[PDB]
Amino acid sequence: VSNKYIIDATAAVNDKIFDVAAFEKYLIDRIKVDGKTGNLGSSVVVSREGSSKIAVIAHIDFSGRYLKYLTKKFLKKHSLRDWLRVVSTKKGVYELRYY
Amino acid sequence: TKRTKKVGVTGKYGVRYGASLRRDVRKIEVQQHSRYQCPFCGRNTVKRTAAGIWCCNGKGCKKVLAGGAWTVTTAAATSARSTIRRLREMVEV
Amino acid sequence: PRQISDIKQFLEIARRKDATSARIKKNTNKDVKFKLRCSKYLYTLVVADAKKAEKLRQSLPPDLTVTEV
Amino acid sequence: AQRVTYRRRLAYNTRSNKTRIIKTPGNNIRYLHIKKLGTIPRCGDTGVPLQGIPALRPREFARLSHNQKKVQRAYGGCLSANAVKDRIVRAFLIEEQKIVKQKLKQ
Amino acid sequence: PSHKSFRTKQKLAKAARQNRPIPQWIRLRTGNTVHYNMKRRHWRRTKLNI
RNA sequence: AAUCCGGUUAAUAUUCCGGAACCAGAAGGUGGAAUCAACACGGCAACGUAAAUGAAGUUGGAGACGUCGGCGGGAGCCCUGGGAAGAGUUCUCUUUUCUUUUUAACAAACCAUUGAACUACCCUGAAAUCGGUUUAUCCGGAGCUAGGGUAUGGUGUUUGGAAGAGUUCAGCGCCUCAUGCUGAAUCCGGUGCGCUCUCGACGGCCCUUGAAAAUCCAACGGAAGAAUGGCCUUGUUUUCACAUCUGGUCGUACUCAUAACCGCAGCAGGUCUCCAAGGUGAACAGCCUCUAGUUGAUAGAACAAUGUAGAUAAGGGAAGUCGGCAAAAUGGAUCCGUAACUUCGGGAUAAGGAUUGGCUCUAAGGGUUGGACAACCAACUUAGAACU
Ligand SMILES: [Zn+2]
Numbered sequence: 135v136s137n138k139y140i141i142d143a144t145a146a147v148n149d150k151i152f153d154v155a156a157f158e159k160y161l162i163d164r165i166k167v168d169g170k171t172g173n174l175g176s177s178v179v180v181s182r183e184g185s186s187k188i189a190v191i192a193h194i195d196f197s198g199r200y201l202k203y204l205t206k207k208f209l210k211k212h213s214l215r216d217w218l219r220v221v222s223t224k225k226g227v228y229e230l231r232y233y
Numbered sequence: 234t235k236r237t238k239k240v241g242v243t244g245k246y247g248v249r250y251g252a253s254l255r256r257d258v259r260k261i262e263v264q265q266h267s268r269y270q271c272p273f274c275g276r277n278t279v280k281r282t283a284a285g286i287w288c289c290n291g292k293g294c295k296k297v298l299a300g301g302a303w304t305v306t307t308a309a310a311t312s313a314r315s316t317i318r319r320l321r322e323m324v325e326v
Numbered sequence: 327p328r329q330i331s332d333i334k335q336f337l338e339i340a341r342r343k344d345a346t347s348a349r350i351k352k353n354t355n356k357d358v359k360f361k362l363r364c365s366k367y368l369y370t371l372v373v374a375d376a377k378k379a380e381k382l383r384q385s386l387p388p389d390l391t392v393t394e395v
Numbered sequence: 396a397q398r399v400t401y402r403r404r405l406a407y408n409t410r411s412n413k414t415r416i417i418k419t420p421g422n423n424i425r426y427l428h429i430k431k432l433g434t435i436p437r438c439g440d441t442g443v444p445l446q447g448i449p450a451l452r453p454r455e456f457a458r459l460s461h462n463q464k465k466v467q468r469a470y471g472g473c474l475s476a477n478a479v480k481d482r483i484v485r486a487f488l489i490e491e492q493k494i495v496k497q498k499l500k501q
Numbered sequence: 502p503s504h505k506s507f508r509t510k511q512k513l514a515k516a517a518r519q520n521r522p523i524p525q526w527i528r529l530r531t532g533n534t535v536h537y538n539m540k541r542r543h544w545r546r547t548k549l550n551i
Numbered sequence: 552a553a554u555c556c557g558g559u560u561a562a563u564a565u566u567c568c569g570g571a572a573c574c575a576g577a578a579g580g581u582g583g584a585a586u587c588a589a590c591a592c593g594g595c596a597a598c599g600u601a602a603a604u605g606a607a608g609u610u611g612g613a614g615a616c617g618u619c620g621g622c623g624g625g626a627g628c629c630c631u632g633g634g635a636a637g638a639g640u641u642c643u644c645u646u647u648u649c650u651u652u653u654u655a656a657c658a659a660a661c662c663a664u665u666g667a668a669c670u671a672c673c674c675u676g677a678a679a680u681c682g683g684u685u686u687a688u689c690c691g692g693a694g695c696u697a698g699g700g701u702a703u704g705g706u707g708u709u710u711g712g713a714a715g716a717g718u719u720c721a722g723c724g725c726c727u728c729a730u731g732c733u734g735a736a737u738c739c740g741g742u743g744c745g746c747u748c749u750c751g752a753c754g755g756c757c758c759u760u761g762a763a764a765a766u767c768c769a770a771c772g773g774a775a776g777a778a779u780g781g782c783c784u785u786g787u788u789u790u791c792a793c794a795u796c797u798g799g800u801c802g803u804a805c806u807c808a809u810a811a812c813c814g815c816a817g818c819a820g821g822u823c824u825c826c827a828a829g830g831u832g833a834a835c836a837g838c839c840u841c842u843a844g845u846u847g848a849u850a851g852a853a854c855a856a857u858g859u860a861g862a863u864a865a866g867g868g869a870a871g872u873c874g875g876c877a878a879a880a881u882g883g884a885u886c887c888g889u890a891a892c893u894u895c896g897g898g899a900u901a902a903g904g905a906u907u908g909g910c911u912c913u914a915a916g917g918g919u920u921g922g923a924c925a926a927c928c929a930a931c932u933u934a935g936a937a938c939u
Pocket of ligand 1: 271272289294295
């Protein structure tokens with residue numbers, strides 16, 4: 135039982151508009167398991183960075199819609215909305231486009 | 234609980250129509266809504282339908298009897314049956 | 327619409343004169359539907375094995391008009 | 396939610412205007428006019444419904460095969476099994492009573 | 502009422518045809534003074550009465 | 552007697568298009584069955600089948616029927632837990648909020664399984680220490696309980712129809728043309744004194760017992776029939792299956808109303824009926840909201856008297872008036888209590904008193920369940936306590 139949700143931001147990473155380093159900590163500090171947001175123990179959702187594709191590995195049948203919701207939360211917090219929009223391409227794969 | 238001192242089935246009529254009329258109706262409806270015994274089946278399943286027709290249910294003896302308005306048999310009809318029975322015997326013998 | 331489950335019965339109803347056209351429908355669940363358009367009824371056969379489907383196609387009357395949708 | 400209209404010009408809830416709600420393959424909720432329920436034929440001697448015969452409208456019986464409208468027995472599809480048995484026993488006994496009456500007369 | 506007999510429909514067709522504007526050349530005919538006509542009927546003013 | 556789905560027009564759709572069906576009528580190519588002689592078999596029965604000859608005459612059934620009340624089932628709607636796609640909000644919080652997640656007629660097989668009769672009938676057997684059983688008291692030596700069967704069978708299940716349709720989302724041609732092409736998802740679950748419709752088994756009421764006919768089916772009955780050189784050849788089977796042809800005529804637009812009808816009118820009047828979301832709430836009450844519709848009732852400026860409609864008013868409380876006219880007052884629910892009189896049924900919600908919010912808890916009342924225990928899921932009530 136494992137999932138490999140992927141979010142891609144190559145549209146803004148190469149343009150130096152997106153901060154995956156802050157996106158790492160935002161996901162880590164805002165992912166909620168069993169109510170509280172501090173239930174990360176490597177037997178649960180783990181985060182990984184490739185400087186262009188943020189990876190969320192799960193073992194508790196996670197949902198990608200919550201991942202998209204948190205990405206939109208980060209988008210509005212950093213005021214990158216109206217320029218970047220998150221869309222779905224593959225199963226468990228989301229990417230940011232300009233539209 | 235008794236639920237009624239004397240009106241009984243006429244409790245549906247409330248306080249109207251008069252006590253004597255309610256009492257007469259009470260006696261009639263008590264006779265009318267009574268289960269009777271089929272003279273051919275021996276079961277207490279005879280019920281009235283439409284003022285003079287009496288039927289009993291079951292797998293057998295689905296007969297329909299022509300009776301009185303609210304009783305299966307009336308005293309006058311029983312007396313007439315006895316009189317006709319007597320006259321028939323005198324004629325035959 | 328009627329459904330058949332017998333391969334030989336479908337072959338006989340295909341060889342029947344009233345059989346005019348056949349349709350091949352492939353589903354995402356690796357199943358092939360053979361639909362025969364007769365005068366009165368449309369007859370559907372469901373095949374789950376591609377190996378059996380290939381031999382069924384080969385054994386089908388070549389003179390019959392068969393199209394794939 | 397979706398609301399439906401009559402599909403015919405009869406605008407009243409008559410016995411001939413029975414309708415059923417259907418969900419078409421277009422996510423459309425709409426009426427479907429249906430006929431009245433059929434009736435099982437009744438026994439001619441006791442009035443009980445006849446076993447083994449479907450319930451259909453009078454005209455629908457013309458399209459059924461012969462064996463679906465009857466029972467393989469004397470008076471099948473017209474009288475019940477108990478009624479047929481009672482008639483057979485009653486017939487035989489009364490004919491016997493006639494025979495013994497004639498024999499006793501002679 | 503959308504449920505009309507053939508006779509009713511034919512009468513309605515006749516009434517509709519006897520409602521058009523008059524061509525001017527007939528009015529311009531010498532010795533012909535048709536000109537304007539009050540025979541024009543409106544559905545909301547004068548009823549046909551079947 | 553018999554039709555559905557999707558699409559299409561500026562205006563028509565169960566009528567057109569595409570697909571898929573059904574009914575009636577007319578004639579009549581097979582085919583199995585049975586016959587070297589008559590028109591099939593199976594089941595101890597209810598009864599069943601792919602056909603399984605049937606003229607009159609007669610009989611039976613369907614058509615074909617009231618009303619009310621409760622109970623149970625189904626379809627649609629409502630509600631709810633996840634996943635997927637898109638959108639809204641994001642000072643802060645919200646694994647968040649909103650939209651979609653669809654399967655028609657027709658055909659086949661099962662049908663108390665998976666939900667729902669012991670509903671009707673049949674076989675074994677013979678029951679008092681009587682038993683079975685509904686929410687509701689009915690059933691049984693005229694054969695109970697129990698066991699096993701038969702029939703009734705869809706708005707139930709699995710399929711075909713049928714994903715190829717429709718819906719949602721996301722890209723490429725970019726003057727784009729007949730509007731084309733390329734991608735995905737359309738999934739898994741649950742719930743109910745819920746609403747509408749319908750079906751099934753019941754009960755109550757009548758000095759009320761709640762149409763007719765066309766038409767269709769079945770039965771009793773036996774009119775009529777002609778193969779034979781043990782093997783080509785015909786009569787039934789077209790109430791079996793499949794196949795061919797035909798289905799004429801009239802209506803079909805639109806309004807159905809605070810503007811398409813009537814009222815002299817684009818009149819605050821009148822005119823029969825179908826569908827009826829969420830919350831609060833007993834509720835189709837009142838109030839707010841979703842879908843849909845409308846923002847149409849000559850407008851602008853200012854608040855004189857008197858008006859029309861709505862409110863309030865110290866103290867008194869009907870002194871007003873023909874007259875408590877009008878208005879005010881009471882009002883839901885729960886818990887106490889309730890007189891005279893009476894036709895004993897009522898009066899009665901008599902009269903007269905107390906409580907009602909929020910929050911945190913407690914107790915009781917019910918449904919499948921691993922080795923008398925018991926791990927969760929899925930539910931609404933009632934009562935009480937503390938705090939504020
Ligand atoms: Zn009796």
